[PDB]
């Protein structure tokens, strides 16, 4: 029943929150200490605030877009057709500096930002959950729910890559301080540059201005492209709240329901781990190994090698699948993984373990996405009406994988720190690129093992295949 057409326009969506995201996580800590002169401990704030304030507002707006009722034009997709008009301008209001407080206070200075970026991340948490939820109420078919995912889930790591790429490109990179010979061999070197021309700042601002502005047009974009196209079907069940069901009667049963939370266990650790190895494999093959120079490449091999993956892994799980293959994709992961630690300095196992790294970050990108329908029909059949909470388990979700990332950059940040991990030169003590590699290739693998074994979800394939026939009428 489902056009192709329809699957290309419900992934298009997938770009604007998963490629401003990285835009922003990876350059709004060098933004704030070169370009917008404020002081280190300020930016630290503004860091600490920003990613606080997503996580306690994910769990909010997923409970207050239950409460909403059946407008004359949708009830999910209106939340996005009244976010984006909004979120633009506030986006675009972060990546400059106008304010002139007469001398530029810092404290007066500093508050045109914090307010904008957490504005910026209440509207595009606004917009995801509804987006993320979408993938149910399309023709309510078993089959085509996952087959919409993949294509969702395609577009995000489309996103990442892209994202971080086009910023690049536009404004440069902050320069290396020492060059690796053919040979193999490091040279240092000095820049020694005051680095205080007032044209070469207002030209770095209206350089920022562009990346935004570009950034910008392919959000709204993406947005009109979601709007017209895909048509958020009409409940045709007669649910409703009967004179039972008080305000809190079903944000009180979603949690603990059994299956659901025995699964977010399982995609909480693979999850962490994941994020640890991506996360710290960005520079492991920087200092523990040689390479120096061309690792801005193999972070790009690996993390588009999870793309090409998504179809055929997919693919994989359209036979014989759907928790009959996490376990393989996992495995997968392992071996290569405790190769590398091992066998060193080659140029060429260092690819292939990479492109197996990405093949396993498809798997643990796309299958606890896809499961989570299979619970959901599970909780409607086995409960009587129950009006509908499907935006609270999305919601929560997302919560979650926020924790999840935000929590692996602050243990490899502590860990890291308790050796002494110096920061400005062309070295490295004996310790750092010791616990480098622990924290790239054993912890994981720990992880790995404990997720694997806590990864007994309820419903196997028969019980799929049985609330196949049930969820009709």
Same mark, same amino acid.
Not at 62 to 67: D, E, L, P, Q, V
Not at 86 to 95: H, N, Q, T
Not at 163 to 188: E, F, R, Y
């Given at each position: ?32 200490? *070169? ?93 995801? &959950? ?40 536009? &404004? ?8 690796? *010979?053919?040979?193999?061999?490091? &040279?240092?070197?000095? &820049? ?10 207002? *030209? ?270």
């Amino acid at each position: 029943q489902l056009s192709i057409c329809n699957k290309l326009c419900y992934a298009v969506g997938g770009a604007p929150y998963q490629l401003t995201g990285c835009a922003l996580g990876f350059f709004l800590h060098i933004y704030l200490l *070169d370009v917008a002169k404020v002081e280190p401990l300020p930016a630290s704030i503004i860091l600490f605030v920003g990613r606080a304030w997503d996580a306690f507002t994910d769990p909010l707006v997923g409970f207050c877009i239950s409460k909403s009722s059946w407008t004359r034009l949708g009830r999910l997709m209106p939340w996005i057709i009244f976010s984006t008009p909004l979120a633009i301008i506030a986006y675009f209001l972060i990546w400059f500096v106008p304010d002139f407080p007469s001398g530029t206070e810092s404290s007066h200075g500093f508050l045109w930002y914090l307010l904008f970026y957490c504005l910026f991340e209440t509207l595009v948490t606004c917009f995801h &959950v509804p987006y993320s939820a979408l993938t149910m109420f399309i023709s309510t078919e078993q089959s085509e729910r996952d087959s919409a995912t993949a294509y969702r889930m395609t577009v995000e790591v489309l996103g990442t890559v892209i994202g971080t790429a086009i910023q690049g490109q536009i &404004v440069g990179q902050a320069k290396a301080p020492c060059l690796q *010979d053919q040979n193999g061999s490091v &040279v240092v070197s000095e &820049v020694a540059n005051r680095t205080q021309s007032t044209a070469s700042l207002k *030209d770095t601002q209206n350089a920022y201005l562009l990346a935004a502005g570009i950034i910008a047009s392919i959000y709204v974009l993406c947005a009109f492209i979601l709007i017209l196209g895909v048509r958020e079907q009409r409940e045709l069940y007669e649910s409703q709240q009967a004179e039972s069901m008080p305000f809190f009667q079903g944000l009180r049963l979603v949690m603990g329901h059994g299956p659901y939370v025995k699964l977010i266990a399982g995609f909480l650790f693979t999850s962490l781990a994941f994020m640890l190895v991506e996360g710290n494999f960005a520079l492991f093959c920087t200092y523990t190994l040689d390479f120096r120079n061309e690792f801005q490449n193999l972070l790009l091999a690996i993390m588009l090698s999870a793309t090409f993956t998504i179809p055929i892994w997919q693919w994989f799980l359209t036979r014989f699948g759907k928790k009959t293959a996490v376990y393989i994709g996992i495995s997968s992961a392992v071996p290569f993984l405790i190769l590398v630690a091992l066998m060193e300095r080659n140029l060429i196992v260092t690819y292939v373990v990479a492109v197996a790294a990405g093949v396993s970050v498809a798997a643990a990108f796309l299958l606890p996405w896809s499961m989570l329908p299979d619970v959901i029909d599970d909780f409607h059949l086995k409960h009587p009406h129950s009006p509908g909470t499907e935006p609270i388990f999305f919601s929560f979700y997302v919560f979650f994988t926020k924790f999840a990332s935000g929590v692996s950059l602050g243990v490899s940040t502590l860990s890291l720190d308790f050796a002494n991990y110096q920061r400005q030169g062309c070295s490295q003590p004996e310790q750092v690129k010791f616990t480098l590699k622990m924290l790239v290739t054993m912890a994981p693998i720990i992880l790995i093992l404990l997720g694997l074994l806590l990864f007994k979800l309820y419903p196997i394939d028969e019980e799929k295949r049985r609330q196949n026939k049930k969820a009709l009428q």
